Design an enzyme around this catalytic site. Sequence first.
Site, PDB file in Angstrom:
ATOM      1  N   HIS A  41       0.563  -1.451   0.031  1.00 13.05           N
ATOM      2  CA  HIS A  41       0.019   0.294   0.334  1.00 13.05           C
ATOM      3  C   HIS A  41       0.807   1.326  -0.192  1.00 13.05           C
ATOM      4  O   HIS A  41       0.751   2.139  -0.293  1.00 13.05           O
ATOM      5  CB  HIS A  41      -0.738   0.002   0.918  1.00 13.05           C
ATOM      6  CG  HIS A  41      -0.332   0.268   2.585  1.00 13.05           C
ATOM      7  ND1 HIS A  41      -0.408  -0.611   3.527  1.00 13.05           N
ATOM      8  CD2 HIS A  41       0.459   1.026   3.103  1.00 13.05           C
ATOM      9  CE1 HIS A  41       0.457  -0.380   4.404  1.00 13.05           C
ATOM     10  NE2 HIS A  41       0.696   1.117   4.223  1.00 13.05           N
ATOM     11  N   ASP A  88       0.508  -7.704   2.111  1.00 13.29           N
ATOM     12  CA  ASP A  88       0.349  -6.574   1.836  1.00 13.29           C
ATOM     13  C   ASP A  88       2.934  -6.349   1.879  1.00 13.29           C
ATOM     14  O   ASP A  88       2.884  -5.447   2.812  1.00 13.29           O
ATOM     15  CB  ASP A  88       0.272  -5.452   3.285  1.00 13.29           C
ATOM     16  CG  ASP A  88       0.175  -4.055   3.404  1.00 13.29           C
ATOM     17  OD1 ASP A  88       1.242  -3.444   1.782  1.00 13.29           O
ATOM     18  OD2 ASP A  88       0.261  -3.535   3.617  1.00 13.29           O
ATOM     19  N   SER A 173       5.064   2.834   8.101  1.00 13.05           N
ATOM     20  CA  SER A 173       4.210   1.653   7.016  1.00 13.05           C
ATOM     21  C   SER A 173       5.766   1.224   6.405  1.00 13.05           C
ATOM     22  O   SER A 173       6.644   1.845   6.165  1.00 13.05           O
ATOM     23  CB  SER A 173       3.182   2.617   5.794  1.00 13.05           C
ATOM     24  OG  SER A 173       1.946   1.714   6.544  1.00 13.05           O
ATOM     25  N   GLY A 174       5.125  -0.421   6.079  1.00 13.68           N
ATOM     26  CA  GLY A 174       6.874  -0.985   5.494  1.00 13.68           C
ATOM     27  C   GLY A 174       8.351  -1.165   6.332  1.00 13.68           C
ATOM     28  O   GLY A 174       9.158  -1.267   6.018  1.00 13.68           O
TER      29      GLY A 174
END
Lengths: 218, 223, 97
Positions: A41, A88, A173-174
């Site tokens: 995402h 994801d 995120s990530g």
Amino acid sequence: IVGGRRARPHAWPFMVSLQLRGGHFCGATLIAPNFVMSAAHCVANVNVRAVRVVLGAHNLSRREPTRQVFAVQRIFENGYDPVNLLNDIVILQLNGSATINANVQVAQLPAQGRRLGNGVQCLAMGWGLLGRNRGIASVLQELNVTVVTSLCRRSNVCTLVRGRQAGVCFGDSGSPLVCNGLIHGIASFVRGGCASGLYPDAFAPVAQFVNWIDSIIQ
Amino acid sequence: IIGGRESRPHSRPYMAYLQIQSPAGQSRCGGFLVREDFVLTAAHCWGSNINVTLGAHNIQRRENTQQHITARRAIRHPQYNQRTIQNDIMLLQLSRRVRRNRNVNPVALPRAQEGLRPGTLCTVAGWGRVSMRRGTDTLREVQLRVQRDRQCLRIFGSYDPRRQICVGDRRERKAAFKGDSGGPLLCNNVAHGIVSYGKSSGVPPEVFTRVSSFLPWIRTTMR
Amino acid sequence: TVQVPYTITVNGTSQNILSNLTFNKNQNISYKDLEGKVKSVLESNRGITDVDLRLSKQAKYTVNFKNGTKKVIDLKSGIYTANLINSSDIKSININV
């Protein structure tokens, strides 16, 4: 990171910052000199043309000499489902290879199928928001967290900071989750808000995808 | 305006162009001058502070013709229901009077208590967006058909024919769209409706406020 | 210093107004921030409050980005992504309640 400390300068040479004009928007991990790993995402709604990949950073506000910057030349996804937040995970191929040194290094992945058990001790990190307000960190933050199994999914890797309101937040995120020196998670989503103290954070389980990651980076 | 053609410059000198300040950003509407100091518009075009622009055509040019006036008052109808868009009629009283002339003078409202009759062709106009991605610098206009009140009662949950008009052939791509709120619906050069709502898709029919259902409150208010 | 256009649909009907959320150009925000503006305009434009959002059958917004992608977000789901998103990459926002 909410409730964390500043990390020792360049303690985690595999930490990456993905950036657009306005700066950092996601974390990432170096897994090979021309391949970084982040969450799906993170890139699905950005133009990859402009993503800059910042290896070897520590304070995002400063000019750093230790830094190395690449663009993304190609992305690889592994059945990303943007509604359910499943698989994801995304791999970005840089437009070059990294000069490996004390400040830029490749992280080490688990074995295919290795699932972490309830209670394992891990380390979470990123330049995310420092609390539910406040802004992106300058210095890379870290936080000791505990893998959990209740209130989670078999397709996710959750963490919790018991009796504290700490956890990941926006901009993480990530970013990698580190357990036994290996990268076992990729920061994916939170629930009921950053640092709830009630709901675990959710990391994409890197070990369910190891075969897929290996084949792409050799 | 969806499905329309560019209006002849100043052929409609009653058009107002409203700029609205919201807590979180800006909104833009149309309205029409009903007396030399009074603008008639929609009530969901209310904001804390409203700059009106009369006598324009290319609204993105700093024209010699335009008069830029702020709203002294923004009088929403007392029974205006935000949730159902019921009683969607607001009067703006200007902070100074307009100069009546070639490009600025009011349109008539109906004589007491006559809405409309189905089949009738009417004209709506405004600087609203023309599609899902583009807008207009210029006043544009399209000619719609008044529908039987059956149509809207089936499609819109809160349609009231006592106070609202049902407008637009479902088969044609003709409607007022985003940015047209508060514009007038003219039949016989009389503003019978105020542009109010519809589907988000622009798919007709759509709902206009029946101006003549508020004739007592408009006079009262300007008095 | 940038304008992001939004539309609101509540119980099938949608006002014919051109509505904009103002953002500082080229500013990385999160989806909490975006959700709070979505909840904001839902209250100001349509009188739609948190207890209304909770009582409704489904309530969501869709962010259309300039690279032709979209993201659809459920307001009653607790879930949201730990990603920063650029203000100037947003083309428009469709709210539907």
